[PDB]
């Protein structure tokens, strides 16, 4: 009973957080095996950020200029390299708390947990979604750079995000763990605008199925629709177009509730057209799009 | 930038979760030092729950009937006692991962993080608030009993909740770590109704201050009010009455924004009277009451 914006247990990632300082800049690093991953802008001063030439700036940095602190002890840096927008610091000690892990590049619409950190220490954990415009709506302040986004499948942590930047609109941009930015953003102090933040239709549908499973059924109507008719409505309301791939992954939710995906689409269509009329669904007065079909199944079945 | 329903990093609590089985009933236990805390209904069968006499049921249970498993290894039970609605199982080994901890009984309106668990394993973490009717709106399924609620102050974990029950309305009831239920609930399979779930006014005000800090200011009006005038409005909308104690703890937020508490109350008054008019505040279409003034300060300043 009940439905919450739930994050993965953060312990396995907490044991990986370290603090990386280079000159007078301090941010968070991720220590996995004998490597510490961190945003490359750790080598920059505030002046460098206007137009940094990271290859040129890195020439003036040696292994001893990278101070890595895990809790209260100092890691010895025996190597360094730049991979896209991340620095990889080879240390002389494997992280004893390194969990089983993978580096994955997620697609927009996918969700993940964020362990927000400052000076190598965790402050909190929350659930996020990679927006269709490749930004994330996080909760990050100066010093949160290097905080990571991840998913957990039983014992394996799949790292998918490393936080780098705050756009002038208060939305966040970052990279996968290979240092490639999500979206068109660059690690530079230059105004970069985000594209249309459309709503993740498949996720709103998954959340409507979760509401039905939990007893919120007022929005169920006597109607059905087609993918093409639905998508005309989705386009008008800046919702992502729904495909048969999306319908396929909503199948287990359709099977559990007995509500055909296209019938749920017709309920969503009427909600978009009429609004909630002062009503709520799962304690929300708007349509929630940061639960994937997988998140709904996991939460509703108790996967640990 | 940004504001999220953020939970405390769950790692320190994850290292405490064990699985407790008694007969054919399995639930979660909390292993701190050499004691395992769990709901006393672990000794009950489904038939016992109709009208259990826990003192009578416990006579037929010995130390060897309580199976405690931490990860994959078995803890030896050398003692057992009932304290209110919790069982305390003395084991022969101190939990090596026992963090610094305290047992605290929270007041309604206070928030905490929940590490939902099944069979001793964590599934996820989310932020909760003890409702004014002493229930919690969690996300729990059968087997989640024994999952705990907590707050963290630097290195000290303050355990405040242990989950026991699901009311017939899908809301949740439980105890502090001394086994005393929050509210009037009893650990019995008997219909027990909850009282009025009023809105936590001081928390909605704290959240309005967080919205102002993050740039959502449309709701700020040209008005002010008094505590007595505000409370007439709060009573009408089933909001908890606001006191000078509440005003005092909103002081740091008032000081940061330059918005007097009574001016923010007048903004809240107009929002209650007029609604949001299809607008949102911090990505929400309703007034959020599960952020305390302390949560807002912590999140907005980066306390780790
Ligand atoms: C101030 C803040 C708040 C939240 N999250 C953040 N990442 C930041 N920090 C920055 O954005 C600094 C920066 C400037 C230009 C390019 C890059 Cl890669 C990074
Ligand atoms: C089924 C479920 C879902 C979510 N949270 C739960 N705690 C439960 N389990 C129960 O409520 C079982 C129970 C029955 C009568 C008294 C007590 Cl103490 C406990």
Key features of this structure:
304 residues, 13 strands, 3 domains, 8 helices, binds N-(2-amino-4-methylpyridin-3-yl)-2-(3-chlorophenyl)acetamide, alpha+beta, homodimer, Thrombin, subunit H, 3C-like proteinase nsp5 (chains A, B)
Can you lay out the helices and strands and say which pair or pack?
Two copies of one chain form a homodimer.
Chain A: H1 11-14, E1 17-22, E2 25-32, E3 35-39, H2 54-59, E4 66-70, E5 73-75, E6 77-83, E7 86-91, E8 100-103, E9 111-118, E10 121-129, E11 148-153, E12 156-166, E13 172-175, H3 201-214, H4 227-236, H5 244-249, H6 251-257, H7 261-274, H8 293-301
Parallel strand pairs in A: 8-12
Antiparallel strand pairs in A: 1-2, 1-4, 2-3, 3-7, 4-5, 6-7, 9-10, 9-11, 11-12, 12-13
Bound molecules: N-(2-amino-4-methylpyridin-3-yl)-2-(3-chlorophenyl)acetamide (L83) (2 copies).
